[PDB]
Amino acid sequence: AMAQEIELKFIVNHSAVEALRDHLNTLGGEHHDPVQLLNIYYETPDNWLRGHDMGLRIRGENGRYEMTMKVAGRVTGGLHQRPEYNVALSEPTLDLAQLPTEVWPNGELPADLASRVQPLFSTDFYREKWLVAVDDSRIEIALDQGEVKAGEFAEPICELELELLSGDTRAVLKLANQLVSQTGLRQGSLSKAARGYHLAQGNPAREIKPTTILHVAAKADVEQGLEAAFELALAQWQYHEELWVRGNDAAKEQVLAAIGLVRHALMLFGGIVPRKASTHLRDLLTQCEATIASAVSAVTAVYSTETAMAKLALTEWLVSKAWQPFLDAKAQGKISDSFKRFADIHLSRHAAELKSVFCQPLGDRYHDQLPRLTRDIDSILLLAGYYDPVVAQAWLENWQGLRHAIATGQRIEIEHFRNEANNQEPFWL
Ligand SMILES: [Mn+2]
Ligand SMILES: [Mn+2]
Numbered sequence: 001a002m003a004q005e006i007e008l009k010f011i012v013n014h015s016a017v018e019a020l021r022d023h024l025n026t027l028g029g030e031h032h033d034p035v036q037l038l039n040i041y042y043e044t045p046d047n048w049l050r051g052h053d054m055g056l057r058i059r060g061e062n063g064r065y066e067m068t069m070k071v072a073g074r075v076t077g078g079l080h081q082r083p084e085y086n087v088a089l090s091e092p093t094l095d096l097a098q099l100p101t102e103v104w105p106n107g108e109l110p111a112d113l114a115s116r117v118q119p120l121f122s123t124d125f126y127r128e129k130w131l132v133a134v135d136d137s138r139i140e141i142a143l144d145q146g147e148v149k150a151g152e153f154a155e156p157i158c159e160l161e162l163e164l165l166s167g168d169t170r171a172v173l174k175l176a177n178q179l180v181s182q183t184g185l186r187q188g189s190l191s192k193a194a195r196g197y198h199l200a201q202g203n204p205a206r207e208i209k210p211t212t213i214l215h216v217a218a219k220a221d222v223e224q225g226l227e228a229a230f231e232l233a234l235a236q237w238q239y240h241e242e243l244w245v246r247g248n249d250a251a252k253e254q255v256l257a258a259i260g261l262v263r264h265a266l267m268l269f270g271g272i273v274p275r276k277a278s279t280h281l282r283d284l285l286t287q288c289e290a291t292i293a294s295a296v297s298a299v300t301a302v303y304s305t306e307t308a309m310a311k312l313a314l315t316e317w318l319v320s321k322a323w324q325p326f327l328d329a330k331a332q333g334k335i336s337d338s339f340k341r342f343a344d345i346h347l348s349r350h351a352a353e354l355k356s357v358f359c360q361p362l363g364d365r366y367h368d369q370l371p372r373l374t375r376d377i378d379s380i381l382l383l384a385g386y387y388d389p390v391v392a393q394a395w396l397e398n399w400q401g402l403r404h405a406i407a408t409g410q411r412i413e414i415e416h417f418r419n420e421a422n423n424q425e426p427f428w429l
Helices: 012-023 169-180 190-200 222-245 251-268 275-294 298-302 305-319 329-335 339-358 367-383 389-408 411-423
Strands: 005-014 029-044 055-061 064-070 074-076 079-087 118-134 137-148 153-166 186-187
Touching: 005 169, 012 137, 012 153, 029 190, 029 305, 074 222, 074 339, 079 137, 118 169, 118 190, 118 275, 137 169, 137 190, 153 169, 153 190, 169 305, 186 222, 186 298, 186 305, 190 275, 190 389, 222 251, 222 305, 222 329, 222 367, 251 275, 275 305, 339 411, 367 389, 389 411
Parallel strands: none
Antiparallel strands: 005 079, 005 153, 005 186, 029 055, 029 118, 055 064, 064 079, 074 079, 118 137, 137 153
């Protein structure tokens, strides 16, 4: 009853726009000159639509109007997969009765919604378009430039979208592979609406989000756990890259931590998914990490080909389920078994590593064990989700305290947390 939009969003570094437009014009597509799109998004005084990850707008294109509702979907790197429903309008006034009932979480429009919605923010941008064919798929490329604005608070729009009109998502990823060979693009996880909503709250600074325990569904198989783990790592990378490029220098550490989590997830599932399933991905991650470490500028590091290629490789690996053809019968059997049972086994494996390494004081050699400690914490974050979160986070807190204290050189706190970590018991079966 609902249509499905699939598009890959890249934020474009402002200085790269001309070179990008030039490059797009070599692809041999059907091109359309820029058109002004004027949008007003609507919201209640109590943030009802944002609460359900839904966006309601009226779009104007030279006096022609369209109402669009998008609802909660999936965002994986730059790839937005959202159910949507579009309705042609005769003038810029909402007609909420024309939307299907499936739009609503309830199955009925709230009685006072039309009465309580107000214009919350606008987007005003010029969109230039190229239609291209890739294999048996058709893709609309859009280059958008303008503003998103909520009263006094505005920010620039400068972005590129590859929307799948029909065919396979693999085609969108194939097209993306050509474009990230030049600098100036980064995958964007924030919709224009998400940014508008944030501006409308007074554009508060975004805070670093420490990774917490992954909670996977009760009866999930190991493959579902794997997917959730990589989704989490990619989401943490996206989130902190966005904060870093917007000026939060402390977010750099968290970008590197998220890339580390990707590596640790590959190790964790390495008894099932062979190492050769991720050779190229891991090579790209290495070059990205080196670029980030030596960068003088977040902008340069984030818009680099090293970062862009690594991120696209991860997005493609995850969305295409690239591990699947590498699995022999034994691996297929193991990946289809219980994630809960898998996690209990691996919790013990990582606990044994933590116990053997940190049972004794290490003097001046703690920093040498950071990679091991970080791997084990990351692995336990991915595995501990079927237990009481208060108990499991409390157990992890001591190891996390140790890791922090080692990283910052706090001698007293190192020994404190090492003792706390060694005195606590396991929480798992
Ligand atoms: Mn879009
Ligand atoms: Mn679109």
